[PDB]
Write an enzyme that holds these catalytic residues in place. Structure first.
Site, PDB file in Angstrom:
ATOM      1  N   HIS A  46      -9.891   1.091   3.724  1.00 28.24           N
ATOM      2  CA  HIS A  46      -8.723   1.344   4.556  1.00 28.24           C
ATOM      3  C   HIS A  46      -9.133   2.231   5.723  1.00 28.24           C
ATOM      4  CE1 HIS A  46      -4.603   2.500   5.777  1.00 28.24           C
ATOM      5  NE2 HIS A  46      -4.277   1.342   5.232  1.00 28.24           N
ATOM      6  N   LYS A 102      -0.026   4.162  -0.310  1.00 25.24           N
ATOM      7  CA  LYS A 102      -0.806   5.284   0.191  1.00 25.24           C
ATOM      8  C   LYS A 102      -0.599   6.476  -0.725  1.00 25.24           C
ATOM      9  CE  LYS A 102      -0.982   3.557   4.854  1.00 25.24           C
ATOM     10  NZ  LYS A 102      -0.892   4.007   6.292  1.00 25.24           N
ATOM     11  N   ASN A 145       0.814  -1.155   0.000  1.00 26.65           N
ATOM     12  CA  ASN A 145       0.000   0.000   0.000  1.00 26.65           C
ATOM     13  C   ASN A 145       0.873   1.239   0.000  1.00 26.65           C
ATOM     14  OD1 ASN A 145      -1.901   1.894   0.237  1.00 26.65           O
ATOM     15  ND2 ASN A 145      -2.618   1.282   2.287  1.00 26.65           N
ATOM     16  N   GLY A 203       2.291   3.188  15.512  1.00 25.99           N
ATOM     17  CA  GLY A 203       2.727   4.520  15.966  1.00 25.99           C
ATOM     18  C   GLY A 203       2.194   4.920  17.324  1.00 25.99           C
ATOM     19  N   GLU A 208      -6.239  -4.657   9.719  1.00 23.63           N
ATOM     20  CA  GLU A 208      -5.408  -3.522  10.090  1.00 23.63           C
ATOM     21  C   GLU A 208      -5.337  -3.315  11.608  1.00 23.63           C
ATOM     22  OE1 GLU A 208      -5.569   0.255   8.036  1.00 23.63           O
ATOM     23  OE2 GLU A 208      -7.419  -0.604   7.081  1.00 23.63           O
ATOM     24  N   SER A 267       1.795  -2.692  11.680  1.00 20.82           N
ATOM     25  CA  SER A 267       3.126  -2.342  11.272  1.00 20.82           C
ATOM     26  C   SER A 267       3.971  -3.556  10.810  1.00 20.82           C
ATOM     27  CB  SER A 267       3.807  -1.614  12.445  1.00 20.82           C
ATOM     28  OG  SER A 267       4.829  -0.739  11.993  1.00 20.82           O
ATOM     29  N   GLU A 286      -7.771   4.722   6.903  1.00 15.81           N
ATOM     30  CA  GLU A 286      -7.665   6.190   6.675  1.00 15.81           C
ATOM     31  C   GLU A 286      -8.925   6.735   6.008  1.00 15.81           C
ATOM     32  OE1 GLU A 286      -3.992   5.749   4.754  1.00 15.81           O
ATOM     33  OE2 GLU A 286      -2.968   5.337   6.687  1.00 15.81           O
TER      34      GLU A 286
END
Lengths: 249, 249
Positions: free
Chosen positions: B94, B12, B10, B172, B166, B212, B96
């Site tokens: 996704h 992005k 991906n 993060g 996901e 990740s 996002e």
């Protein structure tokens, strides 16, 4: 007489490689005897083919949308990406994005200003719905939208700004917009810019008509004092787009 | 046995023509001795070059988003367009886009249903946030999200469905996704599928890990029983994406 007109094709979410290839070559074949910037705003997918296959000295390519920066924004395309791709023109704030995809006045203004800062030529869309026109809110809405954009810019910025007046109220609604109605809206926007940004910015500004534009109605639209060309929807996918450009003479 | 693994990149909203070109040729250079579908999901803008420049037998190209149909949808790319462009894979829902671009469970499901109907291979993304996980709502949210998707599909559709889990909560955040936590999410998923759709579907289904992933953790993540590959973000723009492919052996 006027600033350089723009004939802009908004293909929207349309095209096949074959359909678009043929249209591009029809565009290449056109002999344009006057100063007019022609622009083809294809889908992101088609930007490569268009860039490569469109070789006409009067045409540039544009994106129909973007976000300001690259990164973790799956599905979206950014300004530095477009820039790296050699796209220097962009349509922002289209009624459809404002209606469907959460683009408020501020979101549009921020996108415009980001595009202006990154070097883009921007076609900034404003305009009112039928409901807004019929409730007497044409000036309120349109001037609100442009105020939102302009407060994010400074004088220097306006060299890179084009304003498209989408007469959404006049698209598929029963109401066919007269040259006068077009002129009256464009005059409203130009006076605002004169009064708020200045008469020199107002005199240089291209204000594009983005109601329903076709081969038949374009010339008589274009001839109005404050109409500087067009942001064309469905007709831009057709041969008559040529007659729309010719109508800007 | 595990069905065929998928190593999906991906990208992005990232990449330049030069950066992406170098990455594609690294990908071309790889020697992959086992059966794996590698998928590259670039921005809409980069699809033409990726298509043209990626020449490896185990690679296919994917989009990162679409809307169902062509038409008056300025800025969007549709499934028919992608199809006409030779794009037969797609990442849908996704995190996002759910977070930023209005994709509710229903909207994702509808996109997935349309893509599947259109003949696409679909990487459908589900997953919970850090605070969903810490309020004990992992299974609620994830199984809610897949149910919304599954109810719009029929049995034969699942041969074109990939689930990407996901682990948003692990990217993060300071929270560490162990292979044990990856496995138990994946097992929850495949159990649900087994019990709600059928054990035959669930045995064939690729459930990709999309927390990740990097070249160092991938092999250990892959060896979990219910992990069938990866939807890789940041590491997919890097050389170690090759090591991530190798780890699906």
């Amino acid at each position: 007489s006027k600033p350089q007109p723009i004939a802009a094709a908004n293909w929207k979410c349309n095209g096949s490689q074959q359909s678009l290839s043929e249209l591009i070559d029809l565009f290449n074949s056109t002999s344009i005897n006057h100063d007019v910037q022609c622009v083809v705003a294809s889908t992101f997918v088609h930007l490569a083919m268009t860039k490569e296959r469109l070789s006409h000295p009067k045409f540039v390519i544009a994106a129909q949308n973007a976000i300001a920066k690259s990164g973790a924004f799956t599905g979206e395309v950014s300004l530095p990406i477009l820039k790296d791709f050699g796209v220097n023109w962009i349509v922002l704030g289209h009624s459809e994005r404002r209606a469907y995809y959460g683009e408020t006045n501020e979101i549009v203004a921020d996108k415009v200003a980001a595009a202006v800062a990154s070097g883009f030529m921007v076609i900034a869309c404003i305009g009112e719905t039928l409901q807004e026109r019929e409730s007497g809110r044409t000036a309120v809405v349109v001037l609100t939208q442009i105020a939102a954009i302009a407060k994010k810019l400074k004088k220097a910025d306006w060299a890179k700004v084009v304003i498209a007046y989408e007469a959404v109220w006049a698209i598929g609604t029963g109401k066919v917009a007269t040259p006068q109605q077009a002129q009256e809206a464009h005059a409203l926007i130009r006076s605002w810019v004169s009064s708020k940004i200045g008469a020199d910015v107002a005199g240089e500004l291209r204000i594009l008509y983005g109601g329903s534009v076709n081969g038949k109605n374009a010339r008589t639209l274009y001839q109005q004092r404050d109409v500087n060309g067009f942001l064309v929807g469905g007709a831009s996918l057709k041969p008559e787009f040529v007659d729309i450009i010719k109508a800007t003479q």
